[PDB]
């Protein structure tokens, strides 16, 4: 059933001898050569350099909070950089942050000690994780940190960074405490005067170059992904592709996910219109998102496959016809020396004859074939 067109005709006709005529055997199809995913250019980008490349950092008890929205958040440069000692993602894998959107992303930056870096994670315990910054067990996001000894450490001690030692209750997730009030740890009351049982709850890190790795300053930024009912504001940059035209390619333009061959178009869109449509509610032209231009799409070429053969008793030679297919795209029959073209389609295995004789086998579109000396 798959050796030669005459054999493909015999299988469909369920007969060893095939009468003279034109018989449909299969369906021609042009498969997608490749896949392209084109999305609008990054243009305005999330300014993660405002937090990561910030000149000064806040204390852990006074951790800064920045809202990131209405921008594309590129993360390839983040986890590729080797300057970061800690890069841990909880509840999500590094690949999909460039594919998943969230309504809000929070950048929470502060400075802690080297041995306190492990304390920023769900289900963590310690002085920082209980009195300075608490993370929920269902936290969605990543915690990133990098060594900052060359900046936040000063000879003789840099005391600009402070941390809380005591608190009556554990800090709730995503909570801040700037109380800086005289904490009480005894039955004796107090009136804001330092004494035997009256203590200042704030102590400052001693950051010195000679300190150990566990005693070195470490700048920490926590990125908090979160999805609410309101539609997402930050979408990761979908991987851009090279535009390919005149070749049948699977395409994905902002979720169109259509199949066909794209060519440069002529119709004019209004600037607010993103993709065209035909009468039958089938996508017909698409505005290219990277650069503002119009691309007319047409379906991948397909058509019936017919076998034009005389009686099998008369001959075994056959000629195939691919209806509604241009002759160039056909090769995607072994007698490829002669390839005639007609309005009906691409006729392989026969030769056009300038002379005209009465028709017995109708090819289609006015042309007809026949066995001849």
């Amino acid at each position: 059933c798959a050796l030669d067109p005459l054999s493909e005709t015999k299988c469909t006709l369920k007969s060893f001898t095939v009468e003279k005529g034109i018989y449909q055997t299969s369906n021609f199809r042009v498969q997608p050569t490749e896949s392209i995913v084109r999305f609008p250019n990054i243009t305005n980008l999330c300014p993660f350099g405002e937090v990561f490349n910030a000149t000064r950092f806040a204390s852990v008890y006074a951790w800064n909070r920045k809202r990131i929205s209405n921008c594309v958040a590129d993360y390839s440069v983040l986890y590729n950089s080797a300057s970061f000692s800690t890069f841990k993602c909880y509840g999500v894998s590094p690949t999909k942050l460039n594919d998943l959107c969230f309504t809000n992303v929070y950048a929470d930056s502060f400075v802690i000690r080297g041995d306190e870096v492990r304390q920023i994670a769900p289900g963590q315990t310690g002085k920082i994780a209980d009195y300075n910054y608490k993370l929920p067990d269902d936290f969605t996001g990543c915690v990133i940190a990098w060594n900052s000894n060359n900046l936040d450490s000063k000879v003789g001690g840099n005391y600009n960074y402070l941390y809380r030692l005591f608190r009556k209750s554990n800090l709730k997730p995503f909570e801040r405490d700037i109380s800086t009030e005289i904490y009480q740890a005894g039955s004796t009351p107090c009136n804001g005067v330092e004494g035997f049982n009256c203590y200042f709850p704030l102590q400052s890190y001693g950051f010195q170059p000679t300190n150990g790795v566990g005693y070195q300053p470490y700048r920490v930024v926590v990125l908090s992904f979160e999805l609410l009912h309101a539609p997402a504001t930050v979408c990761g940059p979908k991987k851009s592709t090279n535009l390919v035209k005149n070749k049948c390619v699977n395409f994905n333009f902002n979720g169109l996910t259509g199949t066909g061959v794209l060519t440069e178009s002529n119709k004019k869109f209004l600037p607010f219109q993103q993709f065209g449509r035909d009468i039958a509610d089938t996508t017909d032209a698409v505005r290219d998102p990277q650069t503002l231009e119009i691309l007319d799409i047409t379906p991948c070429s397909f058509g019936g496959v017919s076998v034009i053969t005389p009686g099998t008793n008369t001959s075994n030679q056959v000629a195939v016809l691919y209806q509604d297919v241009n002759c160039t795209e056909v090769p995607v029959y072994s007698t490829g020396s002669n390839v005639f073209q007609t309005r009906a389609g691409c006729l392989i295995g026969a030769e056009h004859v300038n002379n005209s004789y009465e028709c017995d086998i109708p090819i289609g579109a006015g042309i007809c074939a026949s066995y001849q000396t």
Partner: antibody, heavy 129, light 110 residues
Framework: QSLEESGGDLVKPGTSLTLTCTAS?????????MCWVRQAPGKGLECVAC???????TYYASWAKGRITISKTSSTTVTLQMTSLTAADTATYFC???????????????????????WGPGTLVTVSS | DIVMTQTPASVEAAVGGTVTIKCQAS??????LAWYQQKPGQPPKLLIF???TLESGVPSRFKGRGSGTEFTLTISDLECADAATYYC???????????FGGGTEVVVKR
């Protein structure tokens, strides 16, 4: 912060017993991985089976072929079930808490639940006629 | 598919001495190692994680080194309370599995 075990007692061979751990001070979020560590009287420890709340799937040890079942019944309960109890099941069973996190690597992205931090007192399970 | 071989079965030293614990990974475990101290009738307590980082609250004498298939734990200035059973657990991310070692017993010579 606290993990407590229950359900261990003397059970005849061939029947089934259930073991339960309760989450107090925290909830069974997707960021946590729960496993069972069993040690025999005067012997070493071994991992029975594990459940990942992130994916909802469960991994089992090689020595068990459908004999062990894990099901997180609620946000503060995860149950264990051992069938076809034999003398090899006479041991003390513990349950602890782990964390699952993702790191970008050359080959791809891998899930890490490396070490175990906080545990529970454990319940002794004895199998005899 | 992983076996943590722990040698020797026991280690001894006087007060203030040094005892080493040798743990071998049959297949490469990389950096997912932990050490645990366990007393009879009490749950294992984490000493070292990452095989090079001190758990919060543990004394500095509990030191761990090694990577790949050779994992080490040395105790300095042995105390009377250090007499317990120590284990090494390597997490193989390839099979998402935990395997424990045979165990090491600490004896305080006197």
């Amino acid at each position: 912060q606290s993990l407590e075990e229950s359900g261990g007692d003397l059970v005849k061979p061939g029947t089934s017993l259930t073991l339960t751990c309760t989450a107090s001070g925290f909830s069974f979020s997707h960021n946590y991985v729960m496993c069972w560590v069993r040690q025999a009287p005067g012997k070493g420890l071994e991992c029975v089976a594990c459940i990942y709340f992130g994916f909802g799937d469960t991994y089992y040890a090689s020595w068990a072929k459908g004999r062990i079942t894990i099901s997180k019944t609620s946000s503060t309960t995860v149950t264990l079930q051992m069938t076809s109890l034999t003398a090899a099941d006479t041991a003390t069973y513990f349950c602890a808490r782990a964390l699952g996190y993702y790191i970008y690597g050359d080959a791809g992205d891998i899930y890490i639940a490396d070490y175990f931090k906080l545990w529970g007192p454990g319940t002794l399970v004895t199998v005899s006629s | 598919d992983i076996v943590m071989t722990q040698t020797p079965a026991s280690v001894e030293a006087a007060v203030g001495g040094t005892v080493t614990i040798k743990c071998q990974a049959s297949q490469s475990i990389s950096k997912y190692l932990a050490w645990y101290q366990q007393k009879p009738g009490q749950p294992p307590k984490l000493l070292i994680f990452e095989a090079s980082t001190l758990e919060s609250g543990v004394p500095s004498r509990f030191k761990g080194r090694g990577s790949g298939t050779e994992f080490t734990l040395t105790i300095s200035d042995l105390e009377c309370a250090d007499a317990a059973t120590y284990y090494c657990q390597g997490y193989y991310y390839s099979s998402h599995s935990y395997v424990f070692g045979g165990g090491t017993e600490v004896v305080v010579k006197r």
